[PDB]
Structures are given as C-alpha cells and as structure tokens.
Curated annotation (Swiss-Prot):
The gene is Pdzd9. It comes from Mus musculus (Mouse). Residues 27-109 form the PDZ domain. The chain holds residues 8 to 120 of 266 of the full protein. This is PDZ domain-containing protein 9.
Length: 126
C-alpha cells in the first residue's frame, strides 16, 4: 500500500534538528490568477478552519504563479470570504467561476504549518 513515518528511528534513517529564534516577520501573499479553461483546480485539503493548499494543478493558473505556493491559507478567494470555507465548499465555489476571471487570492505564507505526513517525495538531497 503506502508508508508514513518520521525521522529519529532505530533503523537506516536520517535525524537532525532545525530550530531557530525567529518570529518577527509577517508577510501576506496576494496575486491574481487567470482562471483557465478548467480553472485553477489546486489540490487543496481540509486543514483546520481554513483551506490549506496541498498541491497546484499544473494545468491551471496557480500552478503557473510562482507567488502562490501549495501550503498557504486563503482568506478571500474571488471576493468570496473563504476564510471559514470548508473543503467541500471551496470547491463548489471556485467551480461556479467562469474562464478568464480576475480574482484576488489572499493567502498567508506563515499562518498554518504544513503536515509533514503529506509530503513524501521532497526535492531529495542525497
């Protein structure tokens, strides 16, 4: 089937620390995506009271926007306060959108952390 574990183990694995003393920088991301024929079908998931993007549809607008990344927190997608929008709603919302629609996608790049469990195939180091 599939696997799911973390570092620090009693076998051939990798473990290390990555702490820091930072926490004085708050920047918000906001860009206009050009709804494509299929419309930004970003593969977002349901993480908390907010919709946290998990993946962007290559054949979409977001995927073509180096600004928006798979792991933010939208707070107003298309004049539609998606702040408290569910995963089942966020989809039924962006679906009722038409091609070629300029919308303001405001997301946070430091609000909701990303679940490591999800990420399995990273950029690889070794």
């Amino acid at each position: 089937g599939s696997s799911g574990s973390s570092g620090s183990k009693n076998e051939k694995e990798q473990l290390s620390k990555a702490k820091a003393s930072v926490s004085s920088l708050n920047k918000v991301i906001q860009t206009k995506l050009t709804v494509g024929n299929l419309g930004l079908g970003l593969v977002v998931i349901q993480n908390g009271p907010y919709l946290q993007i998990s993946h962007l549809i290559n054949k979409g607008a977001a995927a073509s926007d180096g600004i928006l990344q798979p792991g933010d927190v939208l707070i107003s997608v298309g004049h539609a306060n998606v702040l408290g929008y569910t995963l089942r709603e966020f989809l039924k919302l962006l679906q009722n959108i038409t091609i070629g629609t300029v919308l303001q996608i405001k997301a946070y790049r430091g609000f909701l952390e990303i679940p490591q469990e999800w990420q399995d195939s990273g950029p690889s180091s070794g």
